[PDB]
Design a protein around this ligand. Structure first.
Ligand code: SF4
Ligand SMILES: [Mg+2]
Ligand SMILES: [Mg+2]
Ligand SMILES: [Mg+2]
Ligand SMILES: [Mg+2]
Ligand SMILES: [Mg+2]
Ligand SMILES: [Mg+2]
Ligand SMILES: [Mg+2]
Ligand SMILES: [Mg+2]
Ligand SMILES: [Mg+2]
Ligand SMILES: [Mg+2]
Ligand SMILES: [Mg+2]
Ligand SMILES: [Mg+2]
Ligand SMILES: [Mg+2]
Ligand SMILES: [Mg+2]
Ligand SMILES: [Mg+2]
Ligand SMILES: [Mg+2]
Ligand SMILES: [Mg+2]
Ligand SMILES: [Mg+2]
Ligand SMILES: [Mg+2]
Ligand SMILES: [Mg+2]
Ligand SMILES: [Mg+2]
Ligand SMILES: [Mg+2]
Ligand SMILES: [Mg+2]
Ligand SMILES: [Mg+2]
Ligand SMILES: [Mg+2]
Ligand SMILES: [Mg+2]
Ligand SMILES: [Mg+2]
Ligand SMILES: [Mg+2]
Ligand SMILES: [Mg+2]
Ligand SMILES: [Mg+2]
Ligand SMILES: [Mg+2]
Ligand SMILES: [Mg+2]
Ligand SMILES: [Mg+2]
Ligand SMILES: [Mg+2]
Ligand SMILES: [Mg+2]
Ligand SMILES: [Mg+2]
Ligand SMILES: [Mg+2]
Ligand SMILES: [Mg+2]
Ligand SMILES: [Mg+2]
Ligand SMILES: [Mg+2]
Ligand SMILES: [Mg+2]
Ligand SMILES: [Mg+2]
Ligand SMILES: [Mg+2]
Ligand SMILES: [Mg+2]
Ligand SMILES: [Mg+2]
Ligand SMILES: [Mg+2]
Ligand SMILES: [Mg+2]
Ligand SMILES: [Mg+2]
Ligand SMILES: [Mg+2]
Ligand SMILES: [Mg+2]
Ligand SMILES: [Mg+2]
Ligand SMILES: [Mg+2]
Ligand SMILES: [Mg+2]
Ligand SMILES: [Mg+2]
Ligand SMILES: [Mg+2]
Ligand SMILES: [Mg+2]
Ligand SMILES: [Mg+2]
Ligand SMILES: [Mg+2]
Ligand SMILES: [Mg+2]
Ligand SMILES: [Mg+2]
Ligand SMILES: [Mg+2]
Ligand SMILES: [Mg+2]
Ligand SMILES: [Mg+2]
Ligand SMILES: [Mg+2]
Ligand SMILES: [Mg+2]
Ligand SMILES: [Mg+2]
Ligand SMILES: [Mg+2]
Ligand SMILES: [Mg+2]
Ligand SMILES: [Mg+2]
Ligand SMILES: [Mg+2]
Ligand SMILES: [Mg+2]
Ligand SMILES: [Mg+2]
Ligand SMILES: [Mg+2]
Ligand SMILES: [Mg+2]
Ligand SMILES: [Mg+2]
Ligand SMILES: [Mg+2]
Ligand SMILES: [Mg+2]
Ligand SMILES: [Mg+2]
Ligand SMILES: [Mg+2]
Ligand SMILES: [Mg+2]
Ligand SMILES: [Mg+2]
Ligand SMILES: [Mg+2]
Ligand SMILES: [Mg+2]
Ligand SMILES: [Mg+2]
Ligand SMILES: [Mg+2]
Ligand SMILES: [Mg+2]
Ligand SMILES: [Mg+2]
Ligand SMILES: [Mg+2]
Ligand SMILES: [Mg+2]
Ligand SMILES: [Mg+2]
Ligand SMILES: [Mg+2]
Ligand SMILES: [Mg+2]
Ligand SMILES: [Mg+2]
Ligand SMILES: [Mg+2]
Ligand SMILES: [Mg+2]
Ligand SMILES: [Mg+2]
Ligand SMILES: [Mg+2]
Ligand SMILES: [Mg+2]
Ligand SMILES: [Mg+2]
Ligand SMILES: [Mg+2]
Ligand SMILES: [Mg+2]
Ligand SMILES: [Mg+2]
Lengths: 57, 276, 82, 96, 208
RNA sequence: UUGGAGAGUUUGAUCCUGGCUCAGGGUGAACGCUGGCGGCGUGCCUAAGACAUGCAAGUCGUGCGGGCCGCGGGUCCGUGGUCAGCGGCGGACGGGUGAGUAACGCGUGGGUGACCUACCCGGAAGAGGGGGACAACCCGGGGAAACUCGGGCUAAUCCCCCAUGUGGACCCGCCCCUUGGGGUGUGUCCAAAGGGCUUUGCCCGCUUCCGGAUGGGCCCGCGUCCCAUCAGCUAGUUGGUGGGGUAAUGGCCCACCAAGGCGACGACGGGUAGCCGGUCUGAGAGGAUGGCCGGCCACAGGGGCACUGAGACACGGGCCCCACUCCUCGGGAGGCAGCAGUUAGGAAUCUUCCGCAAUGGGCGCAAGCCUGACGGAGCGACGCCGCUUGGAGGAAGAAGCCCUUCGGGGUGUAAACUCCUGAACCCGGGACGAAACCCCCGACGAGGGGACUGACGGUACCGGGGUAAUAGCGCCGGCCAACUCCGUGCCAGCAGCCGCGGUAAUACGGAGGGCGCGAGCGUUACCCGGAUUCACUGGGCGUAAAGGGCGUGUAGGCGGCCUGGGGCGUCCCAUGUGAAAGACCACGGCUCAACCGUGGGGGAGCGUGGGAUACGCUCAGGCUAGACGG
RNA sequence: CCGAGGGUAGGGCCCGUGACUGGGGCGAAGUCGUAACAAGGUAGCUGUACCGGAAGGUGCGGCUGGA
């Protein structure tokens, strides 16, 4: 789960994409933030596209 | 997302009727939407993308204030909660306008017993709490009719705002109603936005225990102006005085929060429970 | 029976047929026997019609059937002129 | 819930009928002529093989038999009656 | 569409006046003659040795930025020149040059290419008698490039024709003023045109 | 000779080996953030899962007889509608899908002396005589329906017999040919149908036969994926005689006789896959791929089967079994992998639209009828191409914000501001695609003359008036273009590889600034590339991975010197084939471009003919330097 | 007669799952010893054999990539 803070828990519906995390052996996928019950990151500004976060005002 | 209103139906007692249109204020069954669920708002393709208040209301019920203690790490508490205002959006972090503190609203005694606990044993947070849950509200018992004057023409520098409103009691739960009954233009069209900024703001603190005044209707019907003196900051504070005075007038009191409580006990202690 | 036909090519709102000899049973834009001319019905060029008039006379001669508006193009370029 | 496809079926049945019948008689006589050649019985075999000859080609007029099949059917009937009669001749009347 | 931004910064990055602004380019109010260093917080900081890549990258953005042309359309033109016969460098510039919004520039109907773009877009030009509003139109050798007379009575065309009385236009071009037309005689040779670009470098940028 | 870039990462450092990773191009894509206009393309990749509703194949009154509604009057008859029926042609095309298939299935080139081909076109001959049946219709049972049962009338281009025999068919003999090819004689057998109009004459039909054209069937050479941890397979099995079947060859099927047939040149088996034109990548060689479009194949809920027929073992025909679902007690009903659409599954994939105006198709003398082929329109940045968000001027340079050594630097001519142009919108006009069929003249021909019809569409485009009028996304340790402040303190997080973060982080989070693209920008997934990292081009094995523990030898591979025969390889010329589209080059049409048309250039590969003989092959003859022997 | 398929019976291959058990990989700071790398404190490696908590030791023969 990428980003600072999430909202996922048991029974969270979720969408995964490829890509391993080098540090966590056995992890080989990432949760696409901003889809299904995965939220975007609150207060994110740079690279918002990669984190499910919509454009602020 | 876009969707394709294909056909359009009306259910009768003994058959379905296909119609060619559905005028506003009427209702029926549209066939063809795929990804639309309940509470979603549908508008025309070429049309202002509004979201009707569909799906609504929480509400938080326990008010615990957390004083940021000391003092150059207040920003980590205001950032811990920005991690918590997204993991758990049931609660509210709001600064008291006057007295000026950050108050952690919530959903019960236990809900703040976990947030203020996880806050400390994971983030350290230099801060401590009391605190009650003194989270009442305020409303009136009878319809009141007052004025809202705000005049300072003792030097020329602005300050004229006249307002007269009918504040009636609303059925409990309906929130806040606001109608604009100005006949003609005895108050200008541009001063109407920010005279609600004085009413809606003067309801956030109350007349007896200083808690949000909810469940009333406000009909603004009268008021005069000065062409030179009338500033938008002189029509805001005329509505604030009037409401703080109107709410104060016709019988206001304390609406406390009630709980639906399901206690799951062994039957041996049921009476110990019930009576108590 | 074997036919002389317009086989549509080109694009949308850009007809450019390909007056052609083919078995009646084909797809319009399908494998033909021989090509024996073209046609740009919108006359967008000096030559909006050519025909190997030699061959149309051959094919005709062995039973080939012109379409109702394929003789039109065969006639206009005089395959029938004595 | 429609058609003249059903007309085609109603039609194809009478055809089939009329076809099957000719075909029967053909085989029956063809067989019958060959039998009468096997014991020959010379005059009679040819007399019969003629009615067969006749019924074979008459069948080939319609959609019953292909012209080549009636030709096929005919060849074999002849080479059978003839090679049969071979064991003891007297082949009059005519069909040789 | 086009770059459509602040342009003085473009030039300061390039370290070379590209003439993109029109009259002020020659004025001393030009930014390059006030600040000959790149834009933003770090410009007056002592540069560090550019990479071979950096060099080709910059040399290409140069040629690109001059013609105000999408990297897409650019690349497209470049590829066509490689497929085309003989020299790529020449044909690229050539093909770059044959652009209608660019023909209209060296015929000085407008001051800046941006200005010429709008001129082409708004109907004000004409190729060979018919109206043509497509800034990409590949001007072929032998064509007639006029202001359309339905807008010859116009303050801005006048003022720029006015300033184009007796200036020699490049060898491949012919400008009859008053009549306000022009002719694309031939496509430019390499030596025939100077621009602050080493052509060979752009080629090497796409060969990476 | 139009074609070929590499980088980071093993060490303290080096050189080498070697894997890993990145930059590029691509996609029927999808997901995040974002999103103004138009054009051409394109859009269920998954459940060949299940489907509500509408439509997707009919047409001929110039084949025949009929019942009901009219229109002139003397219950009559004519007539034209109309509904079915009989009859004819169509329904085997067109449209969908990729399940099955590793096969003569496809590709390429050939064979058919072993064959069919409705309609269309040429050439020859004929249409004489007689009879007959069944529907419709009138009569009668059952059903809640499908609907059906039985008795009687009747017409024809429906069915049958007789005759004619141009001709064709079969048996037997002979002549030429050589697999069943053409010819001949005697025997036997076989044709047919009328309708119409303006009626001593044409028109559409019918009959047998011959040829053509087109479309096919069957056969054969060569090519077509993974596993040998699948090594042996085969009883209709291989061949033969006879016979059945078919348009036709054949173990295709049957009976008998024989004991065969196939396999390391990979049989059998298992896995996966429709194949091709082409598409993508690549310097090429190569790799990967088969969506759209064109060609063939296969399949029409899962199966079997045959009928009709020129043609089917038939997507919207029949029969039977199975599964499933459906309508209200015997039974019946259904078949969207047609077009739209629903439902399910899925990361995902469109309107229950418009029109037969055109092109093509079916029937028709023709008017015409039908055509979810097709022509259009709709939705989706899916893709590609075009276009807009303004242009010129505007300070040693406002405000705000960022940095600072507190002087200043930066955003930045950017803004404001002036002027100019004028996307949108508004009015006016307004298409090409449409000239045939038909009518008139001629002769129902050649030729001339005339008329009718446009879904898209009041759209494109043209004229006039006309408003400054969306910007976003990734990224800024190195590879790799773009740097500083603050926050944070092995936390929170980043991460494609090397790696960042433990209190002064150009690598995290915000900011200001910068770089790159721009109605898009990024991510994930897959393909080719870089990868000379399966190396034919173009690699290796003492110590890096890699010489079998060593012999002997089977198959196979390779093979000395001279002369001749053949010409198998090899080379050369010609000729046929190598469809169209695509790709390429040139020209042109849409204002450009995408897209689209015309013309060119052709090659590999096979067929045939002709030629050469160095090398390779084979055959013959000779040698003695290899090899073997005394 | 053949024939979809239904049934009976017996085999072959594949896939998933199984008390328990085998060893394998990985995992910032566990326990025991110290086998290897310096003659690594008994040169090392080796095929095999038997033994031993563990690394390993010992026999026989081999190698130098050791003296
Ligand atoms: S003024 Fe003209 S030339 Fe000087 S920098 Fe700005 S644009 Fe470039
Ligand atoms: Mg949940
Ligand atoms: Mg959910
Ligand atoms: Mg980042
Ligand atoms: Mg019998
Ligand atoms: Mg038949
Ligand atoms: Mg027949
Ligand atoms: Mg104007
Ligand atoms: Mg390249
Ligand atoms: Mg390297
Ligand atoms: Mg390293
Ligand atoms: Mg090492
Ligand atoms: Mg190091
Ligand atoms: Mg390397
Ligand atoms: Mg599918
Ligand atoms: Mg695909
Ligand atoms: Mg249905
Ligand atoms: Mg009828
Ligand atoms: Mg038929
Ligand atoms: Mg398939
Ligand atoms: Mg197989
Ligand atoms: Mg084969
Ligand atoms: Mg073949
Ligand atoms: Mg009769
Ligand atoms: Mg007769
Ligand atoms: Mg047998
Ligand atoms: Mg046989
Ligand atoms: Mg035989
Ligand atoms: Mg067999
Ligand atoms: Mg035997
Ligand atoms: Mg399989
Ligand atoms: Mg398959
Ligand atoms: Mg290479
Ligand atoms: Mg296809
Ligand atoms: Mg099947
Ligand atoms: Mg079936
Ligand atoms: Mg199905
Ligand atoms: Mg079936
Ligand atoms: Mg037929
Ligand atoms: Mg079939
Ligand atoms: Mg059918
Ligand atoms: Mg069937
Ligand atoms: Mg169907
Ligand atoms: Mg469908
Ligand atoms: Mg779903
Ligand atoms: Mg579509
Ligand atoms: Mg759909
Ligand atoms: Mg039509
Ligand atoms: Mg038509
Ligand atoms: Mg329709
Ligand atoms: Mg359009
Ligand atoms: Mg678009
Ligand atoms: Mg999107
Ligand atoms: Mg200054
Ligand atoms: Mg400033
Ligand atoms: Mg300053
Ligand atoms: Mg400007
Ligand atoms: Mg027209
Ligand atoms: Mg006449
Ligand atoms: Mg209009
Ligand atoms: Mg205009
Ligand atoms: Mg104006
Ligand atoms: Mg502006
Ligand atoms: Mg980037
Ligand atoms: Mg890059
Ligand atoms: Mg750099
Ligand atoms: Mg500081
Ligand atoms: Mg922290
Ligand atoms: Mg540090
Ligand atoms: Mg810091
Ligand atoms: Mg940073
Ligand atoms: Mg980074
Ligand atoms: Mg674009
Ligand atoms: Mg690769
Ligand atoms: Mg490279
Ligand atoms: Mg390359
Ligand atoms: Mg390779
Ligand atoms: Mg490898
Ligand atoms: Mg090699
Ligand atoms: Mg190597
Ligand atoms: Mg080794
Ligand atoms: Mg070894
Ligand atoms: Mg050895
Ligand atoms: Mg040997
Ligand atoms: Mg030799
Ligand atoms: Mg040899
Ligand atoms: Mg040869
Ligand atoms: Mg071709
Ligand atoms: Mg052009
Ligand atoms: Mg061409
Ligand atoms: Mg010899
Ligand atoms: Mg059986
Ligand atoms: Mg069985
Ligand atoms: Mg059964
Ligand atoms: Mg030790
Ligand atoms: Mg030891
Ligand atoms: Mg030791
Ligand atoms: Mg040692
Ligand atoms: Mg030992
Ligand atoms: Mg022990
Ligand atoms: Mg011991
Ligand atoms: Mg020893
Ligand atoms: Mg050593």
């Amino acid at each position: 789960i990428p980003g600072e803070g999430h909202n996922l828990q048991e029974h969270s519906v979720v969408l995964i994409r490829g890509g391993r995390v080098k540090d966590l052996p056995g992890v080989r996928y990432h949760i696409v933030r901003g889809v299904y019950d995965a939220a975007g990151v609150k207060d994110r500004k740079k690279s918002r596209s990669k984190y499910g976060t919509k454009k602020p005002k | 997302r876009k969707e394709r209103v294909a056909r359009l139906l009306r259910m009768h007692a003994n058959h379905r009727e296909e119609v060619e249109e559905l005028k506003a204020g009427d209702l029926g069954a549209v066939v063809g939407l795929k990804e639309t669920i309940t509470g979603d708002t549908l508008v025309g393709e070429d049309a202002p993308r509004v979201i009707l208040e569909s799906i609504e209301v929480p509400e938080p019920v326990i008010d615990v204030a957390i004083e940021p203690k000391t003092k150059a790490d207040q920003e980590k508490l205001s950032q811990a909660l920005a991690r918590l205002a997204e993991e758990d959006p049931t609660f509210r972090v709001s600064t008291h306008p006057e007295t000026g503190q950050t108050i952690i609203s919530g959903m019960g005694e236990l809900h703040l017993e976990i947030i203020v606990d996880r806050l400390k044993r994971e983030f350290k947070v230099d801060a401590n709490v009391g605190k009650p849950q003194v989270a009442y509200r305020e409303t009136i018992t009878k319809p009141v009719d007052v004025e809202g004057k705000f005049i300072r023409q003792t030097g020329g520098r602005g300050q004229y705002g006249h307002v007269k409103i009918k504040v009636e009691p609303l059925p409990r739960g309906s929130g806040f109603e606001f109608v604009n009954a100005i006949v003609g233009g005895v108050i200008p069209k541009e001063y109407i936005p920010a005279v609600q900024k004085g009413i809606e703001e003067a309801m956030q603190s109350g007349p007896l225990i200083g808690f949000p005044v909810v469940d009333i209707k406000v009909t603004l019907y009268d008021g005069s102006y000065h062409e030179v003196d009338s500033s938008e900051m002189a029509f805001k504070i005329a509505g604030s005085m009037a409401i703080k005075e109107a709410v104060q007038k016709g019988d206001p009191v304390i609406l406390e929060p009630i709980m639906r409580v399901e206690v799951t006990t062994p039957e041996e202690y049921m009476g110990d429970v019930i009576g108590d | 029976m074997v036919k002389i036909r317009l086989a549509r090519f080109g694009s949308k709102h850009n007809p450019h047929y390909r007056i052609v000899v083919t078995d009646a049973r084909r797809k319009r834009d399908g494998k033909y026997i021989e090509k024996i001319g073209y046609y740009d019905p919108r006359k967008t060029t000096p030559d909006w019609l050519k025909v190997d008039v030699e061959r149309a006379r051959y094919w005709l001669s062995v039973g080939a059937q012109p379409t109702d508006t394929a003789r039109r193009l065969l006639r206009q370029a005089g395959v029938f002129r004595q | 819930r429609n058609l003249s496809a059903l007309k085609r079926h109603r039609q194809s049945l009478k055809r089939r009928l009329r076809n099957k019948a000719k075909k029967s008689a053909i085989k029956t006589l063809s067989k019958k002529a060959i039998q009468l050649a096997q014991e020959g019985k010379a005059e009679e075999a040819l007399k019969i093989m003629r009615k067969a000859e006749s019924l074979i080609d008459k069948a080939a007029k319609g959609s019953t038999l292909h012209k080549n099949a009636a030709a096929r059917r005919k060849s074999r009937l002849m080479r059978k009656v003839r090679q049969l009669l071979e064991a003891a001749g007297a082949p009059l009347i005519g069909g040789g | 569409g086009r770059y459509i931004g602040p342009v003085c910064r473009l030039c300061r990055r390039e370290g070379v006046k590209l003439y993109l602004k029109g009259e002020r380019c020659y004025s001393p109010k030009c930014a390059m003659e006030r600040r000959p260093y790149p834009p933003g917080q770090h410009g007056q900081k002592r540069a560090r040795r550019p990479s071979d890549y950096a060099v080709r990258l910059r040399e290409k953005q140069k040629l690109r930025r001059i013609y105000g042309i999408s990297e897409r359309q650019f690349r497209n033109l470049f590829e066509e020149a490689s497929k085309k016969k003989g020299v790529t460098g020449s044909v690229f510039l050539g093909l770059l040059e044959s652009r209608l919004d660019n023909v209209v520039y060296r015929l000085g109907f407008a001051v800046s290419r941006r200005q010429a773009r709008q001129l082409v877009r708004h109907g004000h030009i004409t190729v060979n008698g018919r109206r043509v509003d497509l800034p990409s139109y590949r001007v072929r050798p032998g064509d007639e490039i006029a202001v359309a007379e339905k807008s010859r009575n116009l303050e801005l065309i006048r003022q720029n024709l006015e300033a184009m009385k007796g200036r020699k236009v490049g060898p491949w071009l012919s400008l009859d003023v008053e009549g306000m037309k022009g002719k694309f005689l031939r496509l430019p040779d390499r030596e025939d045109l100077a621009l602050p670009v080493n052509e060979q470098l752009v080629i090497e940028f796409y060969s990476r």
